[PDB]
Design an enzyme around this catalytic site. Structure first.
Site, PDB file in Angstrom:
ATOM      1  N   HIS A  23       0.969  -1.419   0.253  1.00 47.01           N
ATOM      2  CA  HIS A  23       0.304   0.483   0.144  1.00 47.01           C
ATOM      3  C   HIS A  23       1.079   1.291  -0.474  1.00 47.01           C
ATOM      4  CE1 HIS A  23      -3.648  -2.149   1.432  1.00 47.01           C
ATOM      5  NE2 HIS A  23      -4.105  -2.389  -0.315  1.00 47.01           N
ATOM      6  N   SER A  36      -1.462  -1.570  -6.469  1.00 42.30           N
ATOM      7  CA  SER A  36      -1.337  -3.176  -6.740  1.00 42.30           C
ATOM      8  C   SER A  36      -0.518  -3.075  -8.300  1.00 42.30           C
ATOM      9  CB  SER A  36      -2.243  -3.601  -7.160  1.00 42.30           C
ATOM     10  OG  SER A  36      -3.018  -4.078  -5.632  1.00 42.30           O
ATOM     11  N   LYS A  42     -16.051 -11.679  -5.945  1.00 40.86           N
ATOM     12  CA  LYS A  42     -14.999 -12.136  -6.060  1.00 40.86           C
ATOM     13  C   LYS A  42     -14.160 -12.640  -5.005  1.00 40.86           C
ATOM     14  CE  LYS A  42     -11.248 -13.129 -10.241  1.00 40.86           C
ATOM     15  NZ  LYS A  42     -10.952 -12.116 -11.063  1.00 40.86           N
ATOM     16  N   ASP A  43     -13.864 -11.992  -4.177  1.00 38.74           N
ATOM     17  CA  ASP A  43     -13.522 -12.650  -3.352  1.00 38.74           C
ATOM     18  C   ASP A  43     -14.353 -13.695  -2.644  1.00 38.74           C
ATOM     19  OD1 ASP A  43     -11.308 -11.420  -2.946  1.00 38.74           O
ATOM     20  OD2 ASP A  43     -12.021 -10.304  -1.961  1.00 38.74           O
ATOM     21  N   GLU A  81       7.118 -35.608   4.564  1.00 40.20           N
ATOM     22  CA  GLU A  81       5.551 -35.944   3.430  1.00 40.20           C
ATOM     23  C   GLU A  81       5.981 -34.963   2.650  1.00 40.20           C
ATOM     24  OE1 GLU A  81       3.175 -33.543   6.089  1.00 40.20           O
ATOM     25  OE2 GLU A  81       3.959 -32.635   6.858  1.00 40.20           O
TER      26      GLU A  81
HETATM   27  C1  HEM Z   1      -0.941 -22.832   8.042  1.00 40.85           C
HETATM   28  C2  HEM Z   1      -1.272 -23.407  10.272  1.00 40.85           C
HETATM   29  C3  HEM Z   1      -1.235 -24.754  10.710  1.00 40.85           C
HETATM   30  C4  HEM Z   1      -0.514 -25.483  10.303  1.00 40.85           C
HETATM   31  C5  HEM Z   1       0.104 -25.803   8.499  1.00 40.85           C
HETATM   32  C6  HEM Z   1       0.438 -25.785  11.469  1.00 40.85           C
HETATM   33  C7  HEM Z   1       1.020 -28.004  10.974  1.00 40.85           C
HETATM   34  C8  HEM Z   1       0.832 -27.822  11.322  1.00 40.85           C
HETATM   35  C9  HEM Z   1       0.895 -29.546  11.930  1.00 40.85           C
HETATM   36  C10 HEM Z   1       2.014 -30.549  10.102  1.00 40.85           C
HETATM   37  C11 HEM Z   1       0.216 -31.245  12.100  1.00 40.85           C
HETATM   38  C12 HEM Z   1      -0.039 -32.289  12.218  1.00 40.85           C
HETATM   39  C13 HEM Z   1      -0.419 -32.777  10.673  1.00 40.85           C
HETATM   40  C14 HEM Z   1      -1.212 -33.626  11.362  1.00 40.85           C
HETATM   41  O1  HEM Z   1      -1.500 -33.634  12.661  1.00 40.85           O
HETATM   42  O2  HEM Z   1      -2.263 -34.144  10.778  1.00 40.85           O
HETATM   43  C15 HEM Z   1      -0.749 -29.766  13.010  1.00 40.85           C
HETATM   44  C16 HEM Z   1      -1.870 -30.423  14.365  1.00 40.85           C
HETATM   45  C17 HEM Z   1      -1.822 -29.690  15.012  1.00 40.85           C
HETATM   46  N1  HEM Z   1      -1.566 -28.225  15.132  1.00 40.85           N
HETATM   47 FE1  HEM Z   1      -0.565 -27.138  13.864  1.00 40.85          FE
HETATM   48  N2  HEM Z   1       0.060 -25.925  12.586  1.00 40.85           N
HETATM   49  C18 HEM Z   1      -0.811 -24.401  11.996  1.00 40.85           C
HETATM   50  C19 HEM Z   1      -0.904 -23.570  12.390  1.00 40.85           C
HETATM   51  C20 HEM Z   1      -2.024 -24.104  14.571  1.00 40.85           C
HETATM   52  C21 HEM Z   1      -2.291 -23.448  15.378  1.00 40.85           C
HETATM   53  C22 HEM Z   1      -2.611 -22.295  15.197  1.00 40.85           C
HETATM   54  C23 HEM Z   1      -2.979 -24.492  16.529  1.00 40.85           C
HETATM   55  C24 HEM Z   1      -3.436 -24.335  17.314  1.00 40.85           C
HETATM   56  C25 HEM Z   1      -4.101 -23.659  17.483  1.00 40.85           C
HETATM   57  C26 HEM Z   1      -1.620 -25.539  15.484  1.00 40.85           C
HETATM   58  C27 HEM Z   1      -1.300 -26.631  16.948  1.00 40.85           C
HETATM   59  C28 HEM Z   1      -1.229 -27.537  15.887  1.00 40.85           C
HETATM   60  C29 HEM Z   1      -1.819 -28.735  17.234  1.00 40.85           C
HETATM   61  C30 HEM Z   1      -2.363 -28.575  18.664  1.00 40.85           C
HETATM   62  C31 HEM Z   1      -1.890 -30.013  16.564  1.00 40.85           C
HETATM   63  C32 HEM Z   1      -2.077 -30.863  16.998  1.00 40.85           C
HETATM   64  C33 HEM Z   1      -3.879 -31.961  15.955  1.00 40.85           C
HETATM   65  C34 HEM Z   1      -2.917 -32.824  15.431  1.00 40.85           C
HETATM   66  O3  HEM Z   1      -1.656 -33.087  15.180  1.00 40.85           O
HETATM   67  O4  HEM Z   1      -2.973 -34.319  15.338  1.00 40.85           O
HETATM   68  N3  HEM Z   1      -1.434 -25.591  14.110  1.00 40.85           N
HETATM   69  N4  HEM Z   1      -0.420 -28.260  12.783  1.00 40.85           N
END
Ligand code: HEM
Ligand code: HEC
Ligand code: HEC
Ligand code: HEM
Ligand code: HEM
Ligand code: HEM
Ligand code: FES
Lengths: 241, 379, 102, 81, 49, 379, 241, 81
Positions: F201, F205, F227-228, F271
């Protein structure tokens, strides 16, 4: 509704600010636990890592550790151990279980004493008194049999039979063993327990202080140095009027 | 602004909300606090964080881990107390920030107030959950109480208990739910922090004298920055002084006792700073009554700006109200010690005394006073 | 300040008095001839035993016939064997050679 | 606008000041300041302290008032009946 | 779907079906003659009955 | 701005960075992505959060809790997959955002790029730790590998391993350290997000045509917002479609196997989305070589803006380079499938082939091409 | 270095999108576990909560639950108990311990099968084949004694002796028990295991779809409705020039 | 300055437009648009597709190339010696 008595504050080797612990009595007071309190009350939380802080030579307490432990180890290769090996190990509990614990003491639950100082109000003199005090049932009172009358106990009756008398034991030193001494020699021990860093941690206290008196006047100088101008102002109203 | 390193990245143009922020001349140390507040917030953030690493919430195990923490972890002991021992200090940092508020009555700034309001309300609730973490008995029952206090809502109250519980007990869900909240929460507060500042930089700062100072202002970067440098570290001293020599002094809560669901301690009081609020709970015999009494009791702060009646702002030129001001002060400080005691009658009455006393001080006396001064002062 | 100060936070990460108990003192054990098996893990499991803790492989290496003395084992062991062996990768073929298996 | 430029309008004020090196960080700090303690410490102390004193009494007052109330049962009723 | 999703959210935190499974497993109730004390497992505090 | 609800709170004046943000006329759906990105980020935040509640990291227990999660927890199963199944989608949301970048070559905006750079680099590292959480075998060894990959630093490498470890193993510290990081981290990213927007900004754009559009602009609030509205929900479909019918499709990682420290799986690949990076690791026989190969490999993106040589911006008017552009595309897509395979010579050579192929595509060809077109085009 | 065979994809009651599970075989296949796999491989993760989903009446599986369980209950008022009571309980493990487990199967470690479907590649037909296939050692091969040759096993030799033959058992229905049937009747069971919500969860699928076809053309209408103006532009260059 | 005001200078352009209600959301959408598919679909397809085709070959090419390399040991050396 017992008047809650408070222990008179005693001097101590550690009492004062910089006042340290003396391990000589600490070594002794250990034996007491090694003798007495291993009866019921446990302490679960400290490894044999004490060694040199309680002055124990690496071998000294290691070999001392060695005898303490020793249980099973042959269940289809799944074990624990005899003979602890390393220092990481904790004490065997005289009871496996509160059920096993309480019934053994018949409704009484002996507490673990690890932090108990920090639990009870009033520091060590709480116990040392509670150690000291046992009185003759006043006229017009009775007790549960196991309960023994001390005003130090809150309900002033305790199932703990007084352990300490003069020369319950023989100290490691060979010091003549005395109810008060035997009592007082331990009172440093648990005081150490909840805070192993205690001796060490005080260092920072003196460390920070002389460090501290440095900067503040220094800062106090600098600040003023700037403010020197503002408080130096003058004003002049010289209207063309 | 020729070749000024302020505008070269557009970002640092924003950074000129500070360097060149004009500032009032005469300023008590009592204006250090606003900046002083954020200090604690930072230093905290690290402490509970590295602490968060070795600790785990599992209803059976969790507390045990803590023992491991101050003992076998590198410098584990210094750290626990730090995060803790900041907390109360921070609160005493709090009220002072408020304290300056009325004594100069700067609340003239309108929604800014309301912001400063909500900002607080979250914060106390935070450590409340934070205090559960140690899993001490006093934690446990203290936790157990206040939800059990909630239920009194006439129709819908019931479920919300076991809803927040997630069951009939204080168990896992109750705990490990919070270990998110007690953790996730303060950030948003930090996010909120800047907002509360923004509004102030609409109008610029307020003064001691209730007099617009616009005739004189000062570049902030040289000066108050310095007094900050002083004012900042001073905190650390007692903060670092309490922690080492007399750690458990304010560690008045005694329970490392693993919480027994059955067993109850001889005494339950929340930790030191709640207690007056908690005290006022006792007052009403109506259990519902105390609720609308307790929660509302602080909400009064929202209501203050409604009652400014005078023709001059800062109290320091109205002597009379000043009495009330102090008169209120101890009245707060009073409820403490009463709250600091059990429920026997001599205190009870005394406690019962100051309650209605309390409101009268703020709600009536304060608005009443200034009117007459105008007339006294011929306004 | 920071030099002591930051150290403290940092050093927390560094190591712990718990696994500090590792670096085998024991080792001690055991087998007879073949077995192998002959592993455990303990991320390691001086030695001592004697001396030794050089290595052979992970998981009860325990030495090269403990320089002809004991090992567990002491090469041969069961399929494939102790050092050469092979017993290299799943399980073939490079064994513990090297040359002299030490 | 630009924070300082458009602030206000001011006329015929004059200001006088020195380099900080021209002077000292303790221009009779002790001697001059020590009197000032009083005029401020006396100023509010009229208005402020007394309420607390009342409190402190109550502190001992009620405690004492509390104390008897329990501490001695053979008081109102002695142990006779 | 707002009524789907917002709901499907909330009901999560609400109750564990296993936690629910643990309310008043004690049914008993007889087992005990008149005055003759048996025991049972209440809401999780002990009960003499 | 008379009585405009924009200025009444000063706050909403800031809100006029959007309503009245001017906008270009001709815009591919390919500009939905920037806004599209943040969408995933939000929806995530909730999912792992409520998931975080019932889950606990304890090296012995932790994985067990998860079983409890999809089974006995209210709707526990839908939720786990959600947070997960967003992840890859989000990444495919990522590269596209990049994708638009070069195809219109908008990287002319200078530091903005570098921002967009760092912003990414964190994100992948994030879920990396996130992927440890499930505590599967593939997690475990995959975790075990990359740190063991780190150590090759000639002098200081050693400690840093067991320093990050906190020991000789993969145990508690290694895990529960991260459960902070994998959690605490993304917020700061969100904090960073706005910054990356700010700079845009500054200038407004960019377009498809490499032509300053200033002659025509559009109020944003009515239109692109719409469009969003479309572009946003579309994601949800496949996102919600994959999750229910064919949950484990992209759930190609198979291990709910409780990780055996001793036992090793027949195969270890990270992965899906790492794999090309991981593939390139294999290429160099020098273990150190692959490191400076692997990590640097992405760092090239920083270096692109240095190589823009042409006199017109958007590729869509330079046909020749466009070939390279696509030529590179499959080359990426190529390394996937090779990476998607074991270490066996026909692939090996093939893998060994595209590596140096890869750089040549970007590093030499692209800068080489445009020069001649100028001459061809008489520039 | 075995050529990795892949199971031909079979139709199933659940195979198709909306294709559901049929509990009739699920009920039966349970008995199989109740009969067979309780030998070694466990499933730890499911309470007796199945009841009506596997069609079990509240009483039906409760009383069924009652028989299944577990030991003791008299250790100084501490421990577990007989006769599970409620459904929360899990299955007794045939082995307390991998040590106890593996040695019993002599170096083999029977896995827990709870999620195992999602573990192995290739869905159920993996096992059903692995169930089906047992071949006659080719000329030029030998085995570890316990290992039994099936190309389905990755090393193609497995210590598991083929359990299933025609009429290993009698079904709950009384259906004639058949190696393939007995085999195929189970293949639905674990398919259900890892995803109890499976049947339920599909509802949302049809739910969302018809919900979905709603809004997009609707949105698609609205958007255009706005863009209707922009794409309707005209331009006129009428210079005073 | 004010984003739109000071943008640029422009002279003697004229614009013509209607209310959206004046017209429809499908002014011969099918009929008119369907041809347009090609001119864009043909435009880039010259420039883009072929590289992938090469890939797809390699996909099968190397796989096949891989396959023999292991799959049959009695190939280069049959099981004779
Ligand atoms: C773009 C955002 C996020 C990504 C890509 C990410 C990445 C991941 C990954 C790779 C896993 C394990 C994959 C799976 O369990 O199948 C996962 C699960 C988890 N993520 Fe994240 N995380 C992100 C944001 C967060 C946030 C915002 C939280 C908590 C508020 C968080 C906490 C957790 C927790 C607690 C798990 C446990 C559930 C599980 O593993 O099955 N992550 N997340
Ligand atoms: C008789 C076995 C036994 C002996 C020996 C023993 N303890 Fe006691 N101790 C008990 C039991 C049981 C109680 C509580 C009795 C009761 O509850 O009525 C008790 C009381 C106590 C208490 C106070 C009870 C509480 O809740 O804190 C402490 C402290 C204590 N013991 C520690 C000690 C110390 C110190 C010694 C050495 C002087 C010692 N024990 C020796 C078993 C023992
Ligand atoms: C003999 C006791 C026993 C019986 C009965 C039994 N299992 Fe087997 N099962 C084992 C053991 C032990 C293995 C592995 C043998 C080996 O490792 O060499 C095995 C192999 C398996 C495997 C493949 C091994 C793996 O890692 O997944 C599965 C799946 C399995 N059993 C499940 C079943 C099923 C399904 C049945 C009913 C047809 C069944 N078990 C009956 C003990 C048993
Ligand atoms: C930790 C919480 C808070 C932080 C970090 C914070 C931060 C600040 C800062 C930096 C300032 C500018 C310096 C100052 O005037 O003090 C400020 C001012 C102010 N804050 Fe906050 N504040 C906090 C809490 C509050 C609360 C709880 C209130 C009201 C209930 C409040 C209301 C105000 C007011 C009225 C001012 C201006 C006071 C004056 O003009 O002197 N603030 N705050
Ligand atoms: C003003 C800021 C904060 C306050 C007042 C607060 C409140 C508390 C409280 C009441 C406790 C328990 C008190 C005690 O253990 O003695 C505590 C400890 C803890 N807090 Fe916070 N919290 C704050 C910010 C944070 C932050 C930033 C984190 C994590 C990064 C955090 C996480 C924790 C953790 C993990 C503990 C465990 C240490 C322990 O309980 O001994 N809190 N905090
Ligand atoms: C999740 C990560 C990101 C988010 C949330 C994000 C957000 C945005 C948004 C909202 C925009 C404005 C709309 C648009 O132009 O796309 C944008 C533009 C941009 N972002 Fe980011 N972006 C992200 C990642 C990146 C990355 C990884 C890069 C570069 C490596 C980057 C560089 C840019 C550029 C160059 C633009 C302007 C592109 C153009 O003019 O068409 N962004 N980003
Ligand atoms: S609530 Fe239990 S006594 Fe007041």
């Amino acid at each position: 509704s017992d008047l809650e008595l408070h222990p008179p504050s005693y001097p101590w080797s550690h009492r004062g600010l910089l006042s340290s612990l003396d391990h000589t009595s600490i070594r002794r007071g250990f034996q007491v636990y090694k003798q007495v309190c291993s009866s019921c009350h446990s302490m679960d939380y400290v490894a044999y890592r004490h060694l040199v802080g309680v002055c124990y030579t690496e071998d000294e307490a290691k070999a001392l550790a060695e005898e303490v432990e020793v249980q099973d180890g042959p269940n289809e290769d799944g074990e624990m151990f005899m003979r602890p090996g390393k220092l990481s190990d904790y004490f065997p509990k005289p009871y496996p279980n509160p059920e096993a614990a309480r019934a053994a003491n018949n409704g009484a639950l002996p507490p673990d004493l690890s932090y108990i100082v920090r639990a009870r109000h009033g520091g060590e003199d709480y116990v040392f008194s509670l150690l000291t005090g046992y009185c003759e049932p006043p006229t017009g009172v009775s007790l549960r049999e196991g309960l023994y009358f001390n005003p130090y106990f809150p309900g002033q009756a305790i199932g703990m039979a007084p352990p300490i008398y003069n020369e319950v034991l023989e100290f490691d030193d060979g010091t003549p063993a005395t109810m008060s001494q035997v009592a007082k020699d331990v009172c440093t021990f648990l005081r150490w327990a909840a805070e192993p860093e205690h001796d060490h941690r005080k260092r920072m206290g003196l460390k920070m202080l002389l460090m501290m008196g440095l900067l503040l006047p220094l800062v106090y100088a600098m600040k003023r140095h700037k403010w020197s101008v503002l408080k130096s102002r003058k004003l002049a109203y010289r209207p063309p009027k | 602004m020729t070749n000024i390193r302020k505008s070269h990245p557009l970002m640092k143009i924003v950074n000129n909300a500070f360097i060149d922020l004009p500032a009032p001349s005469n300023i008590s140390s009592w204006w250090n606090f606003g900046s002083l507040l954020g200090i604690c917030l930072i230093l905290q953030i690290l402490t509970g964080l590295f602490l968060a690493m070795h600790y785990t919430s599992d209803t059976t195990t969790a507390f045990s881990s803590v023992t491991h923490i101050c003992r076998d972890v590198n410098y584990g002991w210094i750290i626990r107390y730090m995060h803790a021992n900041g907390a109360s200090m921070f609160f005493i940092c709090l009220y002072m920030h408020v304290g300056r508020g009325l004594y100069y009555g700067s609340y003239t700034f309108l929604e800014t107030w309301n912001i400063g309001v909500i900002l607080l309300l979250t914060v106390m609730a935070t450590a409340f959950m934070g205090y559960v973490l140690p899993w001490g008995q006093m934690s446990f029952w203290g936790a157990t109480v206040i939800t059990n206090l909630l239920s009194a809502i006439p129709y819908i109250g019931t479920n919300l208990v076991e809803w927040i519980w997630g069951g009939f007990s204080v168990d896992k869900a109750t705990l490990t739910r919070f270990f998110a909240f007690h953790f996730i929460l303060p950030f948003i507060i930090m996010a909120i922090a800047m907002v509360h500042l923004l509004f102030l930089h609409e109008t610029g700062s307020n003064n001691p004298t209730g007099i617009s100072s616009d005739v004189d202002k000062i570049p902030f970067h040289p000066y108050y920055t310095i007094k900050d440098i002083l004012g900042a570290l001073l905190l650390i001293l007692a903060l670092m002084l309490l922690v080492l020599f007399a750690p458990d002094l304010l560690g008045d809560p005694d329970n490392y006792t693993p919480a027994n669901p059955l067993n109850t301690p001889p005494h339950i009081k929340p930790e030191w700073y709640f207690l007056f609020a908690y005290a006022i709970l006792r007052s009403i015999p109506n259990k519902l009554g105390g609720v609308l009494a307790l929660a509302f009791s602080i909400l009064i702060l929202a209501l203050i700006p409604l009652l400014h009646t005078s023709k001059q702002r800062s109290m320091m030129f109205r002597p009379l109200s000043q009495c009330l001001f102090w008169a209120l002060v101890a009245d707060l400080l009073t409820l403490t010690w009463i709250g600091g005691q059990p429920v026997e009658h001599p205190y009870i009455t005394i406690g019962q005394l100051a309650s209605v006393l309390y409101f009268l001080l703020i709600l009536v006396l304060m608005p009443t006073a200034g009117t007459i001064e105008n007339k006294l002062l011929k306004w | 300040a920071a030099k002591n100060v930051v150290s403290q936070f940092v050093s927390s990460m560094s190591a712990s008095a718990d696994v500090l108990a590792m670096s085998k003192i024991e080792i001690k054990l055991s087998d007879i001839p073949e077995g192998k098996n002959m592993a455990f893990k303990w991320r390691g499991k001086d030695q001592e035993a004697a001396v030794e803790v050089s290595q052979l492989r992970d998981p009860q290496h325990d030495l090269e016939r403990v320089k002809k003395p004991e090992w567990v084992i002491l090469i041969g062991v069961c399929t494939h064997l102790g050092c050469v062996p092979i017993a290299n990768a799943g399980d073939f073929g490079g064994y513990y050679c090297p040359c002299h298996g030490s | 606008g630009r924070q300082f430029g458009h602030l206000t309008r001011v006329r015929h004020v004059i200001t006088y000041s020195l380099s900080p090196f021209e002077q000292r960080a303790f221009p009779h700090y002790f001697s001059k300041g020590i009197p000032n303690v009083l005029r401020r410490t006396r100023a509010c102390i009229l208005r402020v302290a007394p309420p607390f004193v009342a409190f402190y009494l109550v502190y001992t007052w009620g405690t004492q008032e509390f104390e008897k109330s329990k501490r001695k049962n053979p008081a109102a009723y002695e142990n006779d009946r | 779907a707002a009524k789907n999703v917002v709901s499907q959210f909330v009901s999560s935190m609400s109750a564990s079906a296993d936690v629910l499974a643990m309310s008043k497993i004690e049914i008993k109730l007889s087992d005990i003659p008149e005055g003759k004390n048996m025991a049972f497992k209440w809401r999780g505090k002990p009960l003499f009955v």
